[PDB]
């Protein structure tokens, strides 16, 4: 993708809820080991019987760009109208 070519996106929506039925089995999606360093990729349908929901939500404003690309104040500086003699007639910021 090219972060400088602004007018060139990628629409990625959120994940849908797939319908789950009742179960009685040897597979255990919610029993795991935190020690691994892994995060559980469980979905509610592994624990409950869910309906079918279509999530057209998009993770728009949480994009690094939308998050950082809002103009913030970083510093303000002060200076008077004066002569060479007046130290305060100009100013600087590192």
């Amino acid at each position: 993708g090219d972060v400088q070519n602004a007018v060139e996106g990628a629409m990625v929506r959120v994940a849908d809820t797939v319908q789950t039925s009742a179960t009685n089995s040897e597979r255990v999606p919610n029993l795991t080991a935190v020690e691994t360093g892994h995060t559980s990729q469980a979905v509610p349908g592994d624990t409950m019987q869910t309906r079918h929901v279509i999530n057209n939500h998009v993770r728009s404003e949480s994009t690094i760009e939308n998050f950082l690309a809002r103009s913030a104040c970083v510093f303000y500086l002060e200076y008077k109208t004066g002569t060479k003699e007046d130290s305060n007639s100009f100013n600087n910021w590192v």
Partner: protein
């Protein structure tokens, strides 16, 4: 065959008959149906009790009198005690349903009088004491008719039920914009409004939100003459339609 005055409505283990109806109003043109996979948000499987919930519940009927100003009921709250609908509404955070509302009122060729029967969505009522706030017990007696007042005043946090402003700061003669019928004793003995789920959000809590209010207001006063049957009641029977519930936990109020 088939006189259009005669009607038979069956829902669950319930049939209502009428031999003097004036068609039936389907609220805003839409027949009730279940929440679809596109419009859904609560991810859990809904319970849909069908016939056990979706049946005809007759609420406490009121008496129509010559000077009686009017009545209102609030839904789904009026049904909070009606059988398994009430239970489902009690054990679930979210509920959704449409309703077949059937108001009954019979009198005689010699009696006269005319009532507006209307289903008002989001009928948010004003406090009588404009300075203060209203409260639940003066907003709804569940299945018992809350009355409209001819009198412009009421007890602490009572609604301003003065009939000509319909309890909500508007002209009662304009209530007709909402799904409505009229029981004019000359013409008919019943009214039937099939109300869809009208709300800004797919499901809602059954207690917190009174999704709509049933108002029965007499525009032409009940009258009859010399010894011709005084008692003439108005009975409201209502059936939930396409009822489904999400978010199950313990018995609920707080």
């Amino acid at each position: 065959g088939y006189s259009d005055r005669v009607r038979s409505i069956t829902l669950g283990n319930s049939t209502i008959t009428t031999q003097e109806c004036a068609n039936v109003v389907v609220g805003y043109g839409e027949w009730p149906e279940y929440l679809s996979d596109n419009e859904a948000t609560a991810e859990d499987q809904p319970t849909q009790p069908d016939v056990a919930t979706c049946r005809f519940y007759t609420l406490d009927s009121v008496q129509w009198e010559n000077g009686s100003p009017g009545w209102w009921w609030k839904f789904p709250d009026a049904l909070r005690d009606m059988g398994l609908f009430g239970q489902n509404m009690y054990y679930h955070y979210l509920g959704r349903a449409g309703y077949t509302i059937h108001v009954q009122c019979n009198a005689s060729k010699f009696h006269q009088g005319c009532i507006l029967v209307v289903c008002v969505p989001e009928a948010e009522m004003g406090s009588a004491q404009t300075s203060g706030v209203v409260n639940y017990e003066h907003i709804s007696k569940g299945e018992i008719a809350s009355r409209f007042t001819t009198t412009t005043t009421a007890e602490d946090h009572g609604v301003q039920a003065a009939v000509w402003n319909a309890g909500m700061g508007v002209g009662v003669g304009n209530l007709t914009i909402f799904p409505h019928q009229w029981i004019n004793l000359r013409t008919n003995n019943s009214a039937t409004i099939v109300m869809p789920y009208v709300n800004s959000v797919p499901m809602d809590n059954m207690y917190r939100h009174h999704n709509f209010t049933l108002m029965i207001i007499p525009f032409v006063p009940l009258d009859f003459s010399a010894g011709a049957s005084t008692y003439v009641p108005i009975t409201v029977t209502v059936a939930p339609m396409c009822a489904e519930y999400n978010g199950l936990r313990l018995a609920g109020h707080q």
